[PDB]
Amino acid sequence: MIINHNVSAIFAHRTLKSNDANLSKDIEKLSSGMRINKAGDDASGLAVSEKMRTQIAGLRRAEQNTEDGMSLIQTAEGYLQETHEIVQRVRVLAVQAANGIYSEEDRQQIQVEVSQLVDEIDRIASQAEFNKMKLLTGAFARLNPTASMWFHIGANMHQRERVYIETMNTAALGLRNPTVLTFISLSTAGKANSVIGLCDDALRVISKQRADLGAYYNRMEHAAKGLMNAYENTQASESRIRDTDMAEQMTSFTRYQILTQAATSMLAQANMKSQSVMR
Amino acid sequence: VDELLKGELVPENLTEDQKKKKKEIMEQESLWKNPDFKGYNKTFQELHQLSKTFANNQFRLALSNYQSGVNTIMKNRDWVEQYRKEEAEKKRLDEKWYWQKVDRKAREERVVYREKMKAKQDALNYFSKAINHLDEIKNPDLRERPEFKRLLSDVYRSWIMAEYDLQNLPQTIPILELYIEIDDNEKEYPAHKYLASAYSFEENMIKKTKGPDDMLFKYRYKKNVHLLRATELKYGKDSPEYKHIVNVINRDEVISV
Amino acid sequence: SEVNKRLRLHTVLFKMKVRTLPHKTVLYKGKPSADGERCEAADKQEAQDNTCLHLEVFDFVGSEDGKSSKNLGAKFKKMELFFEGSNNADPDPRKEQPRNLTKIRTYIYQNNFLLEDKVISVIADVAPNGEPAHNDKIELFYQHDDYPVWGTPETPSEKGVGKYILSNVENTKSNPIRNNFKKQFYFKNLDYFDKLFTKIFDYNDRDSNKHYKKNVEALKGSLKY
Known part of the structure; x- marks a missing residue:
């Protein structure tokens, strides 16, 4: 052998x-x-898995981006709530000042409060901020903006939406002349009567801006719910390919x-x- | 001679060397042609505000705003006349008592006054825009041109009249004082009459609020000076009007014997 | 076209004192300058020796964006009428028959300050009335950033650059530059300025009608007592 x-x-x-x-x-x-660990196990599966992993991180970050956008919209809407009450207070003061039993001194005492209210409207417009960005001054308007606000609410390159916020100071509300900078007065009965109409127009402008922000908030709420739904489905797809x-x-x-x-x-x-x- | 006949501030088109320099500057600009260029440093670009082309454009902007304001005023006057004619010409089948006619006349006056005030406010906005446009012509030589002086005088006069009719008397004083420093505008008595009224208003406001005595004296002296000047310009020196105004001012002012 | 005949009907404004004008519109009467390039404004706007009509309308760069107040640039459109022969001895402008047009010059200007862009276009018709087709006597000039120099002739080697008479342009089916220009710009431009002249006449006659009505009202005011 x-x-x-x-x-x-x-x-x-x-x-x-x-x-x-x-x-x-x-x-x-x-x-x-993990089912796939090195190249050579499943090259096509690895490429699909890693593409899905990028989407999962992107969708989760895009969901975080959306909530930050909702925070900015919610913050801006809160400032206009104070502006709305002040104009309502001017409007009730103008009805009283329009009556004929008052004298020049009583109407001047009403104008004393009106001046403070106008100043507070201007201060609100000047100091409304989110992360050090002025919101109500006119930077994010549509006609002549100095900047634009886009929320990136998706995981890919061009998935972004725009938000507009108009000017909300006394001049933009029609309560102050934009060229001369004199504002409304209640010291005369005739002037008080015409202020009543001006307050009505100002209130409509504020009500319109609040509706726009409420519309922006509602859309982002749907998108955030959709992004969470998309995230769950994608992660399930990734697990079925990658996880052992x-x-x-x-x-x-x-x-x-x-x-x-x-x-x-x-x-x-x-x-x-x-x-x-x-x- | 109409200084606004051409609707322009300065006509821009001679030396051989200057023409050669212009040609070389054009050739240099051709090489560096870049319409997307934006200067980070604004000084060199802001040098353009001293040129004739910038001044012409700003002059025409101011002229457009001034024409808009004058159009507002004149159209309102025509509307008031037409409205009065129409109100007088229409039939009143339910008007049989005198007090009803009195009430109708009062209603017409209210409507006319409201429309006039609205027109004055709009015209004042246009005139303020024109003033702002004229204020940023920084060429001292171009501000000395007759066309500039004519347009500036017209805009100042219209602004003063509108602001006075809106009962903002103190605001007209700086504009009037600027106005009477142009050409021989100091020899126009309406300016001094407006100044007398405005300074009287300022003195009364100081007296009413119990303000400082220095401001009261200053306002009273300015009012008396401009009142006497307006009296002399319209009626002449050593005239009965001049003597009466002298007596009134002597009574008003502080003197020492 | 026959609008050139119509442009002879605006000789009524020569003896008509113009006080009412449209917004941002300039109009004056004068005599031809050296070489007959433009119109020089006369000291007296009502003299019979006046032989030219100058009508100009200006605007501002950025007005279509609502940014005229930003002073972004200047633009204007004007054209000048040139006549020959002294005007009639009578001073009445109401009864005026058309006279002969020596030349018609149109001028388009635009200057963008922000872009440093200046474009000037000039059209000169030295034979306005007399022939329905006088392309050989229609001068076209295009100047960009002061280039080429004013009065520079066009050479056949470099076509499209410099002052070129209208006969130098091609009018084939492939490129109907002649027909496109005539149909699009020239007819509309001449009609616009003719209608502007007629509007000026309408306003300055309504002025006299208003004066007469005001006198009638003043006289009627004395019937209340």
């Missing part, structure tokens, strides 16, 4: 080498929890582990087989 070489040992070692590599690949999938089945992978791991034991047992048999003819 041939003793120079052991072909049976070579075959048993070749089988053992291949199954040992299959065991290593099963350990990688079990310890990391632990129960199924454990079965593969056990099969290869036993195959290694059988190959090792037979390899020890092939080495001893050669000694038979030495007797």
